[PDB]
Amino acid sequence: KSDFTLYHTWPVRVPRPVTEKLSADYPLLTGQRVLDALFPCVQGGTTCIPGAFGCGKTVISQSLSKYSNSDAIIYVGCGERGNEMAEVLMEFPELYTEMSGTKEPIMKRTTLVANTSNMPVAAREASIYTGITLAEYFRDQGKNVSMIADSSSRWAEALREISGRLGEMPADQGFPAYLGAKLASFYERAGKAVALGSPDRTGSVSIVAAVSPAGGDFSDPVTTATLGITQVFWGLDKKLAQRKHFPSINTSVSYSKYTNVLNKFYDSNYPEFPVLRDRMKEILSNAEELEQVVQLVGKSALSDSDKITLDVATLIKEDFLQQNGYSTYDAFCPIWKTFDMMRAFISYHDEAQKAVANGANWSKLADSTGDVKHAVSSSKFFEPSRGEKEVHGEFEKLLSTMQERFAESTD
Amino acid sequence: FAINKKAVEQGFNVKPRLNYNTVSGVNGPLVILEKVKFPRYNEIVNLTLPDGTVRQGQVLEIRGDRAIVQVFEGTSGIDVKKTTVEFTGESLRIPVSEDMLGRIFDGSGRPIDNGPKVFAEDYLDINGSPINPYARIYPEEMISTGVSAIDTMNSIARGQKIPIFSASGLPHNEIAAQICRQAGLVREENFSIVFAAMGVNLETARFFKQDFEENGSLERTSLFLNLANDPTIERIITPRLALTTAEYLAYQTERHVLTILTDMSSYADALREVSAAREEVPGRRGYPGYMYTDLSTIYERAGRVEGRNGSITQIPILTMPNDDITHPIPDLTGYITEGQIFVDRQLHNKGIYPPINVLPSLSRLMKSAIGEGMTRKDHGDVSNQLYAKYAIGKDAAAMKAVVGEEALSIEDKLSLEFLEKFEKTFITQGAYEDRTVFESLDQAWSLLRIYPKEMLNRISPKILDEFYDR
Amino acid sequence: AFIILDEVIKVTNRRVNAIEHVIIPRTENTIAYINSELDELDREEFYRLKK
Q1: Do residues B90 and B43 lie in contact, with contact meaning Cβ atoms separated by under 8 Å?
Q2: Which residue ranges does UniProt annotate as crossing the membrane (chain B)?
Q3: Contact check, Cβ <8 Å, C43/B282
């Protein structure tokens, strides 16, 4: 009594059944240097990008959709400005990515669900369940997909509006009492898993939300509710955006829980990655602490080591963590290039502290080296796509020349 | 043509309407009817007070046989014995025709220029269906406003929506008048201008009528005025009337329109007032919970279309309560819109016109309009360099006032010199001075001569080598 | 005495300038923010009781 065509339907509020859940242990390569280096994400993990009223929260999503290493993408727009869709459906058919040859269209790999801030309110909720059911479907075919949700706080606003319309007790700032349960049951659909069926294939879903708190505070009930359930978090700063410093991530408040489970991948490929990451984070934190006093003491009682620490921190914040968005050279920094730049910066700082360790004055070294700082600051221009071994040799010889110069310039 | 002759043939029809002399209460600005015989949600009625003065209303809820009507022109004087309603069997519609240009209408869209009625070509609902996103195209153009701070550091592409945040007492009116008087495509001044002012004093209306008259622009414009003493409820209709007129003009006669909304703060206040009359759940600071959607359905009506040539550009003027960018109204206005120009109080106290600071202002579609084929190839990053140097000047000056003038390296001295000149010569300009983008960029380069080439890092070396020496 | 007095006056004036310029306004802004938050909570409590 059953006839099956080439298609079938499915209720949207019932997650599709799966054989068993597994642990995601393969990194998701974004392309952005800061995200890959300090706050990595894993293929099958969640994330938040709390906006701060126009701080380039679309650049991150744009890059993620353009260059992520996923077999499919499902870009969802809930409460979108409406103009953006007109740009994302014009750029893609004019851009290409290569996987088994250069296939000119990227649109062949993407579907879009659009619900602008103008269209009816009640359809905001039904724009994310529809968005994620397709992602689950494509997972069932053993493909690594990734859903890039737009503002999820607008969904909460729609929930509040309808709740108030019916008439019922609000919990916080009007939001209904059951907000905390709607979100969790949505984020819980993410993650790697083994599909249900005979041929024994595997897939994954990796959602990346983006909340839009009122004002700029992270006390919004929407914000404080996702941070309780997510696994990665990427704050955003306003002044950094106002200075044209993109990406505008706040490196002192963001964090990532998928920092150790990637040890297997690093050992397979890049054994010394985590050590360099920790050392750089320590450098930045120390620089922040040291600068915390210069604002009211003046840079008078600063030893040579502190001055070098501040100089290195400024160098890093100006070169390493600025991706300059779109260009021909720094648009998608591969993992190896980021690793080599990381090692070069750490080696520069180490040698600078070594030479001054023996009493040699750093002030003279400042202009005695001269070319070392320019070399490290211009290393970011090395053109990718020129060969993994191509720039590998250049970065190999760069640090050798640097340490030879330091030994010679030790005078 | 036949298609024209059939769209209106349905007009030749007569449909009588009922009169209900049955009211069953009044409360606040609301009125409750009874035994209404198939109400319709969002209808229009015509109250006829016992005095003989007509008013107008709009249903908001309909139960089995009750209709709750809110009245525009207040509710006082109404009686439950002699009043009389009359259901028009329709929503609210505006009579439009391309002869509206050069006339004046009040808050309710009826002439106040001692002229005749509109003698329309068709009636249009003040609301409008959203635009199919698949049928929208992004600007790829640029408007030369003649203001260096607006035409170099930011940019305006026709089809874009840009607010103007300004405190109370600052000359945002003068800036808007200058922009509308002095705007053209970068190599037209044929921008038909619809203008809607809500919650303004008599002096502002007189000033705006004066400025449009001496510049020879009053023959291609259309003004909707809703002064401060007019009924409060009508302030909600006015922007919808103005935008409906603009949409008709642009998308059905192929002409480029530019729209001004004089005071969105008054609109927000009216929304809050009407909401509090009912018992809707409030958002932060008391504003309604759904204000975001209501603002969105006003702003998101600009842009271009695939099969048409018209394009309507918005310049809503908004006033912050206490110079607080974290207030709900600016927050939602800048979440919905794409960029916004900021008028600064601090620069105003020093007699700098236009008192525009550049740090807190943004223009989303700048990166597309600028480039090559329309301006010089340096425009893309000279703005970034100026941004960085201005930001450095700000904190250098801030540091000078704490530690004194002992720890200011040469970098800080150059930054302070740049900060002083960048405000005293570049931002400032006259109230009748044009500035083509070429001249503005030349002046901008002149201000980077202070810095030696070796530390202008944000800028590209190629541009430096070809322009830094000329 | 000249040298010592110069040093002492310099340090004290520097400290006074720092306190005046980058301490008081920060605390004032914090106080204003907290004051606003308290009323924000009061409004919600009032609304619940009204319902």
Answers
A1: yes
A2: none
A3: yes
